[PDB]
Design a protein around this nucleic acid. Sequence first.
DNA 1: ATTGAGGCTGGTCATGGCGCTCATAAATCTGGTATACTTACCCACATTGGGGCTGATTCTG
Length: 51
Amino acid sequence: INRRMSIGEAKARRAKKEMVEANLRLVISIAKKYTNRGLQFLDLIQEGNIG
DNA sequence: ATTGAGGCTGGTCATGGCGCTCATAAATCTGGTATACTTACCCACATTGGGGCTGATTCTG
């Protein structure tokens, strides 16, 4: 049971990582429009990645 | 140098606005979820150090 659920968790983590790497572009595109509101572009894109 | 009274040393009785403590409560402060589709920003000097030559002593075919 332990290693089966470990394999399942690893598969889920891989799929989620793939989704995040695919949608990084959308994150950047959304974060483009808040670059002049007292926050850095890198901070904005990191918050977008978290979201 | 005594004994007859005033001024002044001991404690009575609460008294009274102040401060710490309890409790109520609406305003203030935090966390949370939204499903038509949106995918790569915007000057002049002096000195030391790194990298590319430049021979110049060692070895070679």
